């Protein structure tokens, strides 16, 4: 038949959203494709002008990449008063990756937009959510058999006006390698890093005509070391000796972390705020030992469910972690984040990410994992349960989450205990099946505050290789999120505004032959508000395919007063397809 090469018009699509008005897209698929293709997306809009997109794709042995372009002359107006506003909307980016066969990997992830309101006005692909940033990174990586070196130049471009300016890692050089050894002898590892974090803060106030000022960018809410820039060097040598047996394993590991900071405080940060409170040191120094003992056992069993023979392995695991305490409050945060509690949290050398914060540790992590494997080697089910036992407290915290909250914030959020003697219970369950049955659950329960920190229950239903019947049911909860507060310039635990308790329903189901129903409903119980809800039909003829849906959804917005607002929209979407 061939006919993969539709070098003509692709089945168009219509959209009447009563906000964007009438919108007709008529794609053209350039099939210059022995291995690489091209596509043109000329979108006509009613409220806005005629626009065009260009998507080039290439896929070969040792190479992969997608180039994107887009232009629109803005017919729609009255987003004028909004700052950083442009009438010539454009987008151009390159997502490249070359040299998968060689030791020289050249990755590229660049994307430049014209204005922060590009995705809030033109983007419909990512419907429910909308990206608040785009990647501007370029990575070169050498990868020897014994070591790995990487030069990375990564930055971010804000697709919004209500978030702080992201830091730049203009030259991040990492050298992580190991050392050749013989079975029974010691194993040596090393991780070196050098990053120059820089950032061009835009704290310039924006004006009106009579109202004078109407709002200032969030960057002007950063205080002191929050405005810090500069370089950081990290040296991390380590040694490990894994005694492995057929029934168990014990692995001692001793590492040493040395970090040095060459900072700059841009004056306004240090001359005003610092001097108003404390002193500033551009030359910073940190050196810690680290002890980690990882033990584990292996049990086996023979079961038979529904005639199918399964191997139920029981895997108990213990891990002691010791890191002495050092005051790190004088350090700024560049690449450090503190992930919420889970089962994986039990087996990490540091409760923080990045290198700006090294968690003071003296813990005994106890866990267990029972998994069911069918004799073709396939993992069908998995259950994990664990808890950490603290012998000391957790004094090293993010800016605003340490005893800063006691003084300069007078706050004490509910569910925050860093002085208790134990962690929440962590449960991670998973039940799978190849004909796309998939239920995944996660639950974290703090016994001290007697509160649920995190919850998750995801379910994906499919039948006997029939792609017509799909049923997705998801429930999510989150109240222990540690995020940077734009309005406070520091970190914050469990933001009342951003607490997650949402459900996501989805379904495609056959009614009568050639006909099927499509539906989805996302709902936030915290706001008691529906995020997204659409429903419609799919007529599957012998010749053509017609999909029609009525859709309601919330989109991100940042008004002229620079506050995060959510704004909804309802519309009809129609699409034709030949396959």
């Amino acid at each position: 038949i061939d006919d993969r090469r539709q070098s003509g018009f692709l089945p168009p699509s219509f959209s009447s959203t009563s906000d964007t008005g009438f919108t007709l897209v008529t794609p053209y698929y350039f099939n210059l494709a022995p291995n690489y293709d091209a596509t043109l997306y000329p979108r006509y809009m009613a409220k806005r002008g005629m626009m065009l997109e260009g998507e080039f794709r290439y896929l070969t042995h040792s190479s992969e990449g997608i180039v994107n372009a887009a232009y629109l002359n803005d017919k729609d107006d009255h987003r004028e008063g909004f700052p950083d506003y442009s009438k010539d909307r454009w987008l151009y980016g390159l997502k490249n990756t070359t040299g998968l066969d060689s030791r020289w990997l050249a990755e590229v992830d660049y994307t430049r937009i014209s204005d922060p309101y590009y995705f809030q006005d033109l983007d419909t692909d990512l419907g429910v959510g909308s990206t608040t940033y785009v990647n501007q990174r370029g990575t070169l990586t050498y990868r020897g058999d014994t070591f790995t070196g990487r030069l990375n130049a990564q930055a971010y471009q804000l697709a919004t006006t209500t978030d702080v300016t992201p830091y730049d890692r203009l030259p991040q050089i990492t050298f992580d390698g190991f050392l050749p050894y013989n079975p029974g002898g010691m194993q040596f590892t090393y991780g070196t890093e050098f990053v120059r974090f820089d950032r061009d803060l835009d704290e310039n106030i924006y004006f009106n005509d009579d109202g004078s000022i109407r709002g200032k960018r969030p960057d002007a809410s950063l205080q002191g070391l929050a405005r810090a820039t500069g370089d950081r060097m990290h040296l991390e040598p380590g040694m490990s000796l894994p005694m492995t047996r057929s029934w168990g394993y014990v692995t001692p590991t001793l590492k040493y972390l040395y970090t040095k900071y060459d900072l700059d405080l841009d004056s306004q940060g240090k001359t005003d705020l610092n001097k108003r409170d404390e002193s500033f040191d551009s030359n910073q120094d940190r050196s810690l030992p680290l002890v980690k003992v990882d033990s584990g056992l292996y049990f086996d069993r023979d079961t038979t469910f529904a005639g199918t023979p399964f191997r139920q392995t029981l895997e108990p695991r213990a891990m002691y972690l010791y890191v002495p305490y050092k005051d790190q409050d004088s350090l700024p945060v560049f690449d450090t984040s503190e992930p919420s509690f889970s089962y994986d949290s039990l087996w990490r050398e540091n409760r923080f990410t990045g290198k700006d914060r090294i968690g003071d540790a003296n813990q005994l992590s106890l866990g267990v994992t029972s998994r069911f494997i069918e004799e073709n080697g396939f993992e069908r089910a998995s259950i994990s349960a664990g808890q950490i036992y603290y012998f000391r407290d957790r004094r090293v915290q993010l800016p605003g989450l340490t005893e800063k909250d006691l003084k300069r914030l007078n706050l004490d959020p509910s569910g925050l205990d860093n002085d208790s003697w134990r962690s929440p219970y962590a449960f991670a369950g998973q039940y799978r099946f190849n004909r796309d049955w998939r239920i995944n659950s996660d639950f974290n329960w703090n016994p001290n505050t007697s509160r649920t920190e995190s919850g998750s229950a995801i379910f994906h239903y499919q039948p006997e290789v029939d792609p017509g019947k799909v049923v997705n049911v998801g429930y999510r909860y989150r109240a222990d999120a540690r995020r940077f507060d734009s309005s406070r310039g520091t970190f914050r635990y469990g933001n009342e505004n951003d607490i997650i308790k949402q459900h996501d329903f989805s379904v495609i189901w056959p009614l009568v032959p050639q006909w099927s129903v499509l539906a989805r409903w996302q709902y936030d119980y915290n706001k008691n508000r529906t995020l997204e809800a659409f429903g419609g039909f799919e007529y599957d003829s012998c010749c053509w395919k017609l999909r029609l849906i009525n859709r309601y959804w919330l989109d991100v917005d940042d008004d002229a007063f620079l506050v995060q607002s959510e704004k909804a929209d309802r519309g009809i979407f129609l699409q034709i397809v030949l396959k």
Partner: protein, 152 residues
Amino acid sequence: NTSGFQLRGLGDAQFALKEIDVSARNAYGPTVRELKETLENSGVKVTSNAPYHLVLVREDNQQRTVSYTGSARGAEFELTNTINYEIVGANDLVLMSNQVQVQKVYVHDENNLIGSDQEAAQLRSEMRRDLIQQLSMRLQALTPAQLDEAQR
């Protein structure tokens, strides 16, 4: 003896196939390297000279938003790592083929992008080692008795 559980003994983690040519679309990378490493530590030597090859084609790292903030912005991201492997035998014949995947969720901060990237990186490492674990479990159950039975 009430349960039926008892410690694992050599005969279980014996690994039937003691040699196989492990290759990947990403010839030099963390996945394939740590894979060959784990296999060698398990007792299986890796060499290009082999009638049986384990080929990793198309390793995919996808990401989607799974929860939203109070301002309808991304709150939690779900990373899904998926590796498509095929076992090849004599004369470049695909003896068998399947996929192995895993997924995890992390909290994304719109005001701390680099920290979130670091968290995502660590998560990707853990997921990587999990996928390698699964591939190990799958390769252990293999037997040299399973032939090509090619027919055309």
